[PDB]
Design a protein around this ligand. Structure first.
Ligand SMILES: NC(=O)c1ccc[n+]([C@@H]2O[C@H](COP(=O)([O-])OP(=O)(O)OC[C@H]3O[C@@H](n4cnc5c(N)ncnc54)[C@H](O)[C@@H]3O)[C@@H](O)[C@H]2O)c1
Ligand SMILES: NC(=O)c1ccc[n+]([C@@H]2O[C@H](COP(=O)([O-])OP(=O)(O)OC[C@H]3O[C@@H](n4cnc5c(N)ncnc54)[C@H](O)[C@@H]3O)[C@@H](O)[C@H]2O)c1
Lengths: 363, 377
């Protein structure tokens, strides 16, 4: 049967959902709630058959949908999960971060415990082809992952609808908003929960000259995070939002006693100027310990997927797995509520550590 | 001044003739590099191990051997001294030299191992009438030198400095001395003093805080020395905060033998990024794999996005003389000029050596306790 989606919030990333759903056989967007006119026009040009609703209540009351995507601003997510839970529980793909406000953790945990349908948190990085390749090969190459290092070097946060992503109260803070992906990757690779975070971070460069109602953006733009895991593995994140010139936006290194594996992940092709030549191809580098003979493999993305989004086709691959769960051919929520909450708790811990200059314990 | 006692805390609340003392692997590197200097020679060696005395004699056949520090100082015709003894020996030997025959000294890293020696060694250095140069040579490796010269201009000001060392396990040493923290000072002191010093040099500021995670995860766990298992760390991460707000990160892995580049160093600021790619010793590159990796620097300007890569090759003659990309030779050129009086600058001071050791001790304490460690100076 066809899978019919409803979308709550349809700006840049909700438009990337619309384009990638459109590439799936047997899926369609039937319903959209998007309160911004310009975005309503942009969504209506992408998905002309989709009906618009004036509210979440109106969409849930009348739409014929099998599942929902939340792509509203970060601070909206927890209230919209609670509203859907009280109104019409459906399989839900909630954009990261799962939530922004620590005060919401108890009530959302209780909501998720009682929610009779899947909750999938849309941390799609594991499906970027170079990252997926590293995940599939890391155990065999490393002989067990002792250390995992992740580096994000990119350009400053884009301008958003109502400028929402310029303030911590709206985003959850930069380690929550941008780095939840990397924290979740640490748990996926190491297959253990974190026990401690140590961080250093600041707002060194970005948005310091910007004013909104007389207020200065307060979001971090760089830092380092060390994460200790139950039983002894360790990981490190490096973030810089003013490193626009880096050839690869993400690099991920996994090391163990038999070898090392590294992924090189390009940024969005739309931000690679044509005057710079062809964008970088994604790579994986395998460096076995005993031979010292390195292997480099190109892991290109299907051009149709590069056309549909900014995340190396990962949004499409995420939807294929989500649709399989909605259809019932799969039982698996690959990125659960609990994975989303761990990744948020790790970013909150990093922000608290960076603010206090002290280690932060997690339980 | 710093105050830390009970509940009181100021921070952290919410011809030139050379004598050689020690002539194993690194003292033999000093012999080969001194021999490349015009108007320098090794006149005197104290090396207590017969097999190393034979190896040292084959390299520097005109050098005279002495049975102790006291014997060398009593009768050797020398203008300066190199200390390349095991780490735990350095403090006692500096004190001995200061009491007997102070001369210009090139003291191998780490400057010391035991925090109980800091006060007495600082007293010795304050009263010492000749230069003390701590032999942290990495700044002279051609790719690192290029990064140090260009980083301010490329970055528009260094906000972040990331250093990574991926290499093979600690080599076997005379009497197995480098297998035990009491002998080495711990791995962040023995191996990573170089990187902590490069952070102070690049950022031109002192550290205020260290956060670290480290362990002995893999290496030497199956070795036994008359019942003792080695206790040295083999991997970790260190975050260092600086006066003025710059931050740095060190990543160490002593079981990443396969990494093409043994050291990589990245500096990032609002105008761009610079990265150095530093090969390990050519003698450990398998000849079946072809030519060893060429040192490189990569310039990534923020607004242009026009990336440039430069090859920075080391003179073959210097690669034949040592394991450190010719840096031992460059160090010796500068030290020799200071001994001759053509220069007055000690580029790597006692204080620089002590800072790098204190940063490694803080990292080890932070990793052992799971807590941030404050530093004052
Ligand atoms: N997974 C990823 O890689 C990725 C990438 C970018 C953004 N995101 C996430 O997507 C979400 C949206 O980010 P974006 O870049 O699309 O921002 P955006 O500003 O481009 O789009 C947000 C949209 O939400 C609408 N909106 C505002 N309040 C709403 C409400 N109460 N209910 C419904 N819609 C509402 C706005 O009108 C706007 O069109 C955020 O949670 C963000 O973190 C995820
Ligand atoms: N890049 C560098 O700067 C670099 C690299 C390697 C080693 N080092 C330093 O060089 C020193 C020696 O390391 P190595 O690799 O040559 O070790 P090694 O074991 O190869 O050589 C040390 C030598 O010291 C001799 N020795 C022991 N006790 C002594 C004493 N009391 N007085 C004099 N000599 C004594 C031993 O017999 C041995 O030959 C250490 O401080 C080490 O950290 C520095």
């Amino acid at each position: 049967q066809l899978v019919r989606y409803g979308i709550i919030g349809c700006g840049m990333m909700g438009q990337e959902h619309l384009r990638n759903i459109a590439l799936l056989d047997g899926a369609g967007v039937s319903a959209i709630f998007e309160p911004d006119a310009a975005m309503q026009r942009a969504a209506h040009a992408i998905a002309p058959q989709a009906a618009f609703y004036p509210s979440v209540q109106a969409l849930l009351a009348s739409a014929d949908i099998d599942c929902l995507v939340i792509a509203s601003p970060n601070y909206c997510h927890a209230d919209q999960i609670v509203e859907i839970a009280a109104t019409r529980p459906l399989p839900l793909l909630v954009e990261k971060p799962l939530l922004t406000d620590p005060a919401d953790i108890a009530r959302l945990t209780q909501t998720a415990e009682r929610y009779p349908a899947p909750i999938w948190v849309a941390m799609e990085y594991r499906y970027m082809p170079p990252i997926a390749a590293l995940l599939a090969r890391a155990e065999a190459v490393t002989g067990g992952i002792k250390m995992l290092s992740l580096r994000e070097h990119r350009f400053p946060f884009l301008e958003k609808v109502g400028d929402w992503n310029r303030f911590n109260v709206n985003t959850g803070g930069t380690f929550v908003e941008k780095c939840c992906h990397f924290f979740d990757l640490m748990r996926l690779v190491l297959r253990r929960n974190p026990v401690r975070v140590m961080a250093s971070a600041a707002q060194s460069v970005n948005h310091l000259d910007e004013r909104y109602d007389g207020k200065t953006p307060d979001i971090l733009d760089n830092g380092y995070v060390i994460v200790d895991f139950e039983g002894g593995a360790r990981a490190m994140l490096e973030l810089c939002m003013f490193a626009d010139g880096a050839r690869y936006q993400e690099t991920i290194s996994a090391v163990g006693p038999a070898g090392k594996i590294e992924a090189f992940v390009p940024g969005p092709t739309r931000f690679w100027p044509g005057d710079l030549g062809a964008p970088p191809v994604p790579l994986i580098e395998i460096s076995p310990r005993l031979s010292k003979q390195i292997k480099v493999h190109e892991i290109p993305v299907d051009p149709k997927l590069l056309k549909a989004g900014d995340h190396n086709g990962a949004t499409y691959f995420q939807h294929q797995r989500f649709m399989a769960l909605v259809q019932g051919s799969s039982t698996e929520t690959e990125v659960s509520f609990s994975d989303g909450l761990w990744a948020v708790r790790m970013g909150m811990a990093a922000q608290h550590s960076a603010a206090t200059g002290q280690a932060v314990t997690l339980e």
